[PDB]
Write a protein that binds this ligand. Structure first.
Ligand SMILES: [Cl-]
Ligand SMILES: [Cl-]
Ligand SMILES: [Cl-]
Ligand SMILES: [Zn+2]
Ligand SMILES: [Zn+2]
Ligand SMILES: [Zn+2]
Ligand SMILES: [Zn+2]
Lengths: 29, 29, 29
């Protein structure tokens, strides 16, 4: 259970970073 | 508290999926 | 470890509010 919760948080952290990257590209590119 | 944390992570998941789909729309005009 | 997860979760909540707002702006030019 603990490992699943860490994995999910880690995955969410990567998804925000991907989304901010893409937003910046759309705004400025 | 564990259960509150899991709900919060599920909320966050629902919100980044929504935002991903929004960004996609923006990418296509 | 638990405390750290909670702080990371709060951080992420702030980040997705920020990105939600930014995306609302970009949607409207
Ligand atoms: Cl566990
Ligand atoms: Cl595309
Ligand atoms: Cl702890
Ligand atoms: Zn596509
Ligand atoms: Zn496409
Ligand atoms: Zn709106
Ligand atoms: Zn509008």
């Amino acid at each position: 259970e603990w490992e699943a919760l860490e994995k999910k948080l880690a995955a969410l952290e990567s998804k925000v970073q991907a989304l901010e990257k893409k937003l910046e590209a759309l705004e400025h590119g």
